Amino acid sequence: PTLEWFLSHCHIHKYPSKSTLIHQGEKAETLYYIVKGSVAVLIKDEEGKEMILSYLNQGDFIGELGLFEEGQERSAWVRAKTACEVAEISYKKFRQLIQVNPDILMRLSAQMARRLQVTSEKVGNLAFLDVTGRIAQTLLNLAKQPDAMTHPDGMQIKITRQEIGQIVGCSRETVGRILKMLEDQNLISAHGKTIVV
Amino acid sequence: PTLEWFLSHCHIHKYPSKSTLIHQGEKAETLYYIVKGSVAVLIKDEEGKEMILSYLNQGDFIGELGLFEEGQERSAWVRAKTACEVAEISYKKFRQLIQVNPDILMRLSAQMARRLQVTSEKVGNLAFLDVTGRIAQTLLNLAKQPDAMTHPDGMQIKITRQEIGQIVGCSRETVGRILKMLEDQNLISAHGKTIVVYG
DNA sequence: GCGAAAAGTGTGAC
DNA sequence: ATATGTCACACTTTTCG
DNA sequence: GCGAAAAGTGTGAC
DNA sequence: ATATGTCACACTTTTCG
Numbered sequence: 174p175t176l177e178w179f180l181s182h183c184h185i186h187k188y189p190s191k192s193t194l195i196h197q198g199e200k201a202e203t204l205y206y207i208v209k210g211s212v213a214v215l216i217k218d219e220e221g222k223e224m225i226l227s228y229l230n231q232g233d234f235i236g237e238l239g240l241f242e243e244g245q246e247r248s249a250w251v252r253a254k255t256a257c258e259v260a261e262i263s264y265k266k267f268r269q270l271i272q273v274n275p276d277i278l279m280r281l282s283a284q285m286a287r288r289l290q291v292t293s294e295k296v297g298n299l300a301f302l303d304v305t306g307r308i309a310q311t312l313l314n315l316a317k318q319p320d321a322m323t324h325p326d327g328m329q330i331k332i333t334r335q336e337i338g339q340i341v342g343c344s345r346e347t348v349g350r351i352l353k354m355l356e357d358q359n360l361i362s363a364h365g366k367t368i369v370v
Numbered sequence: 371p372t373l374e375w376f377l378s379h380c381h382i383h384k385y386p387s388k389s390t391l392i393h394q395g396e397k398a399e400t401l402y403y404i405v406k407g408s409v410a411v412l413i414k415d416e417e418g419k420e421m422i423l424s425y426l427n428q429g430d431f432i433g434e435l436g437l438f439e440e441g442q443e444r445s446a447w448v449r450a451k452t453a454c455e456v457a458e459i460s461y462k463k464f465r466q467l468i469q470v471n472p473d474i475l476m477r478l479s480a481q482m483a484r485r486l487q488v489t490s491e492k493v494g495n496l497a498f499l500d501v502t503g504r505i506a507q508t509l510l511n512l513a514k515q516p517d518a519m520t521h522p523d524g525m526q527i528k529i530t531r532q533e534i535g536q537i538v539g540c541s542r543e544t545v546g547r548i549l550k551m552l553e554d555q556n557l558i559s560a561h562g563k564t565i566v567v568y569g
Numbered sequence: 570g571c572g573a574a575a576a577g578t579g580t581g582a583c
Numbered sequence: 584a585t586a587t588g589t590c591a592c593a594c595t596t597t598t599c600g
Numbered sequence: 601g602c603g604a605a606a607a608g609t610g611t612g613a614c
Numbered sequence: 615a616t617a618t619g620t621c622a623c624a625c626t627t628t629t630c631g
Contacts (some may be wrong), residue, residue, distance in 0.1 A: 191417075238483040345609065347587060350610080501618070547618095
């Protein structure tokens with residue numbers, strides 16, 4: 174609909190998996206769009222520890238926060254979870270496409286709107302739930318979003334305790350002994366893959 | 371400017387301190403705007419422990435997360451920190467107000483860009499810093515807010531150690547202690563009103 | 570500006 | 584208290600040419 | 601579906 | 615190896631009518 178006139182004016186690129194689309198602090202000049210695939214947003218403490226803030230996918234805009242004031246820089250990091258085709262438009266041409274048609278600027282804002290809600294939750298979990306709890310929300314919320322494939326009884330999913338470790342914010346081994354205390358307790362089963370029940 | 375174009379379409383409302391302007395469950399259908407005053411956004415623990423997410427000052431929009439979808443609830447709480455003339459429109463008259471002068475969709479979206487930056491940072495702080503870390507930072511920030519009196523040396527923040535405990539995610543006593551330590555180092559001076567930068 | 574009622578705060582071994 | 588992190592390395596379990 | 605690295609992971613007790 | 619949460623209430627400071 175609106176997207177094709179939009180998606181026409183962009184330069185399109187294919188990023189191999191694990192590439193770095195965006196760097197923290199780099200000066201924000203380009204908006205992006207995930208035409209194919211998925212990406213990861215994560216930030217970093219000067220002493221190297223990193224935390225995933227979210228997974229983004231086909232349909233979502235990227236690097237939109239730089240768009241509204243200028244001077245500023247990329248707020249987070251965006252790596253390629255897998256291959257992607259990314260339409261890229263300078264802020265400037267986009268600042269224009271909005272003057273022609275108001276619909277794409279909305280299609281952005283809706284996007285930032287649910288992300289400001291999904292993020293605020295994440296603050297509350299970090300502050301109210303102990304790790305064990307955050308991990309069960311992660312294993313629920315993960316095991317549903319499109320990556321997840323319909324297990325007979327309780328969807329399945331592929332995640333490393335390492336990575337659960339950077340969403341929940343604890344470490345592979347604590348993620349470890351706890352996860353098991355779930356299999357035992359009986360609300361999940363796992364072995365490389367994680368079978369939610 | 372057309373912000374006035376906006377208010378002249380809106381309808382004000384006077385609130386008093388501590389009054390909860392929005393509540394975490396109800397249906398979003400109005401989009402506030404803070405004429406005069408400050409308000410605080412916070413969520414709650416399964417039993418009441420609050421966690422203030424951010425304060426919102428005059429010239430801010432409130433409850434704009436429903437504006438882009440139907441039948442979504444209000445996601446947090448918002449209580450007047452002070453008195454607040456808070457303008458109102460409704461979702462639809464607002465969209466009707468958009469397809470005409472695109473400007474304020476822009477002025478709203480911009481505020482929602484900052485918020486995700488600030489909130490992203492907060493999740494950095496909770497996940498990376500330890501309490502003295504997070505409390506120093508809270509103090510760097512509030513020292514920087516709009517509601518901060520000037521002091522010869524440093525900024526005079528006015529605040530309740532109970533509040534810092536909420537903002538930061540720690541209990542009341544932990545704040546009291548840390549606050550003490552920082553004074554001993556001569557980094558602040560406290561007594562209800564606090565001064566950041568020695569004293 | 571008054572103070573009385575309400576709200577805020579330390580303390581310390583687990 | 585009570586919850587969670589941090590150590591080394593041989594260990595699985597998953598990678599793919 | 602072949603094995604061989606490459607990843608990813610469980611110790612425990614401070 | 616560690617940090618911060620806990621519990622009660624005299625005592626201190628803020629509120630607001």
